[PDB]
Subunit: 305 residues, 4 copies
């Protein structure tokens, strides 16, 4: 297995399509009847469009569904030195403008949920009808957050190992060294990656993603407080498992109760309807671990826009 050669991809239930956005090619898949309201699905970090493979089938009964590979992931362009929230987000603006061509409901998981909120605030006018942020690391994914734990006290331990042992565009590729260091890590999420083989979704991932989160450059020019304070559409914030590790004090999960509270206050001050669904027993990737439950929450909220 050689992720650096980008020859790792496998079949999926929907055909894969590509669009030139200008700087990058973005790979995506499509499901459902084009006469239905459009939905855009943005995956979690290290997740490709097919992170949503099962939920797409359920959602396609009611919506025209697009799921995308972000730059640095899947079959989309890898762009050294270019990974930032603003480049991710403007990629998605161009996708909506060039491919979807009608208003969309956007759902994103974790960093994808950060980008869904990015679009709510910063898309072109009228591109969006509402957004679902699925377990988003508001503040918790920033190096210098306005509120609560930083990324160094949450997912950063994992990103540090990715940066060191996998490297930009898999330039190091030391899977054995990664597993050795991960098995001895204080992060339960880090220890979770130790395996004989490389998970498929991680084979498709550009680990420079991890560098820009760990080093705090990905969001340097996009502070979360200013983004959250400027959303322009309804927002559903889903909040899954979270807790504090007694051994280290680090955050477990995507964001703390305090970070969720401050994020909700910020979006409420922007003048939009903010719904909050707390599912403390769910994994962060509910759209994949509990697809029917996720689609139930999604469709309930989508119907009331």
């Amino acid at each position: 297995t050689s992720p650096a050669l980008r020859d790792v991809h496998v079949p999926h239930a929907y055909p894969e399509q590509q669009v030139d956005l200008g700087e990058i090619t973005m790979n995506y898949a499509e499901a459902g009847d084009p006469d239905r309201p459009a939905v855009l699905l943005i995956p979690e970090q290290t997740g490709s469009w097919w992170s949503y493979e099962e939920a797409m089938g359920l959602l396609s009964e009611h919506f025209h569904v697009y799921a995308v590979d972000l730059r640095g992931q899947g079959r989309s362009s890898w762009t050294p030195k270019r990974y930032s929230l603003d480049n991710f987000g403007n990629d998605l603006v161009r996708f909506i403008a060039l491919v979807v061509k009608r208003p969309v409901v956007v759902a994103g998981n974790s960093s994808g949920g950060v980008l869904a909120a990015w679009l709510s605030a910063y898309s072109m006018p009228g591109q969006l009808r509402g957004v679902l942020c699925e377990d988003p690391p508001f503040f918790a994914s920033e190096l210098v957050p306005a509120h609560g734990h930083s990324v160094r006290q949450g997912a950063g331990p994992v990103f540090e190992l990715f940066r060191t042992y996998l490297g930009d565009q898999w330039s190091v590729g030391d899977w054995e060294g990664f597993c050795r260091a991960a098995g001895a890590s204080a992060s339960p999420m880090a220890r979770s990656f130790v395996a004989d083989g490389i998970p498929q979704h991680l084979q498709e991932y550009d680990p420079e993603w991890a560098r820009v989160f760990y080093e705090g450059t990905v969001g340097l020019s996009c502070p979360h407080e200013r983004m959250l304070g400027q959303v322009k559409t309804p927002v559903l914030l889903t909040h899954h498992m979270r807790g504090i590790d007694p051994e280290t004090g680090n955050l477990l999960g995507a964001l703390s109760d305090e970070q969720a509270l401050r994020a909700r206050r910020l979006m409420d001050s922007a003048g939009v309807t903010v719904d909050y669904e707390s599912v403390p027993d769910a994994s962060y990737m509910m759209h994949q671990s509990a697809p029917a439950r996720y689609v139930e929450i999604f469709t309930r909220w989508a119907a009331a826009l």
Copy 2:
């Protein structure tokens, strides 16, 4: 300037468009059936930096001149100033207002953004770009080639950051003039004046911060942008030199930096025209409008 009530009338009516995050102010001139042109001002310059050249270009072109975010009547956006946000604003402006392929001309930092659009616009948006005295590399904190911003315009930016401040929150013009008067940078000493120039009153000095601190282009290194340009490019290179007292760069970019930038743009496969005008000021479109429009029209006429 902090209250943003300083604006005055101009030879053209001003229009505003909602791009999403920001409102963009601009002016329009010429016949809607002529080829479209987009003019991007230098740093601290509003759209009306191009007022004279617009008149001359409007005989042949449908001309748009814009205020970038943090300038003029466009939105001020604290903590958001980066090349990619400037650039994508302009992508949106072309898509929502111009709605036709455009020829883009940009002065200094506007010319960096002209090259940004050449490489990173949506497909087919651009026919070609004129980069008027662009500080390739020299406006970066850590350039691949040649002088850094700290050895170029950085001394000016340090003074703006310290004495004017983000969104004019400090606004110590007397303290700025005192310090600029004692600066080794000739460009800094050129701002000493009793009153605040009109263009600078409209300017958000957080601009100077993000250039001085190296954050504006952190996720947009110039060598990767220059190596991915996709349209014909005309690079005009105006006055430049070395100050013996400091070794600092005078002008927008050195001959070495122009050479390395042209090599990258050539490696991207595009036709790069290089016009060296070592007598001209960096803002030739304003100091010598007819000469600027001649160079522009000569080159634009030859585009497919």
Copy 3:
């Protein structure tokens, strides 16, 4: 205001002032007590000069040979543009002990001075220190990217931002009017406290580049607190004064959180030293100045127990 930028602001105090050339800088200091008694070094809080301790020095001089110092960028000590770092502050103090005190010392520091006392416990030359008192120290909370809890941006950072912008490096801006306007609009109670009664004398002696390097996270970039605390080599007393959470912002009030204190104590315990912890939640952060008798009581009680059995 230009007087602070010209550094002609200094006034007399209760003790005469002395200077020593440490190499890069001149360090100003005051001395009290019997040279026959055990030596003590007092390190002020940020914006505080040696005379922050003036009253406590009188009380301590009864039983100790007391030295109180101006750090670089403060008081009459050298202002050093672009050189403000925990390592440069700390090595200044190492040289002061070596060149002036010439005896083992008990070190007591307030807030950032307490961070520097811990620095010395870990990183001084061998045998220079017998123990350190860390008076309300912002362990982790004065860092831009701490291992644990609140960052400086969620604590004292709002004050440092206003100092950086309106006072400026070496007081080059000096916009006190603008500072007060912005401060009166600030959510930080510490920020608002600086407005009344003009520019405090201690602040006029202060180089606000201090505030820049804390706000920008450069002061301790090469000196992470977790590695410092895990390598202390002397007994440590940590006094923990007022602290809480502001409901309006979630920001820390005080020097460090109870979580940060716990994690700091755990690291110092793992270093193999005796760690004492005294919680005084009703005290201001500068207890040595606001309640000198109470401070000297804590100090002397603990210093007595440093005596070998």
Copy 4:
């Protein structure tokens, strides 16, 4: 990985670290302190020590991160420099003449400006990357246009405290580098001196943290002892525009101007045919230059 050498080795506790060193010559003669280049141990000077020990009391040291303590997250010019201040005060206990090669010569200048008063009689800066080892220098080429390419490969393929240790991947990338210095490191086995090196050294130079709080122009403008600056091979690579050698002629001029304004005697010796480690590749030549200059210092 450490091996025997021609001189016995000693260790001293400086506080945070233990410092390894070797000592040679008559303890009655004037003291000399030798600081290696980056990735160099004290025995970088082994042959030069023999020659110098006939007239001088010679000390050669391992800096932190090179048998001296490795100290993760603590590598900075000021921590390097204060280590040496402590070594002089605790070990040498007499004024010293200091010679340092490349980054060691940066530290020799550091000591001239920032040591404790009177610790130093003079410094020799052997091919020092003044400015050129900084991320944002006041003058000339930055580290990214000089030795940076090498440091980037060390950071990625070797890693902090050799935590990655992908020597094969390093050799592959180095052999294909446009930097001749990088290409020079390719070898089937790890050189002994590099086995002794903490590559977090390379990280802090590449990332510009090593000297963040120690800008070179303020250091050079505050030197307090005589300075000898030796300037070896240097040039421009036409393919990249990058600097070859330690510093440019422009950077040497700007450094000399600052040291002149500091108020000290500055001597400049241009040897454009010499490699940067003249004390190792041409020891007799190096000791001739040093012994001449040191004899002119006030006894």
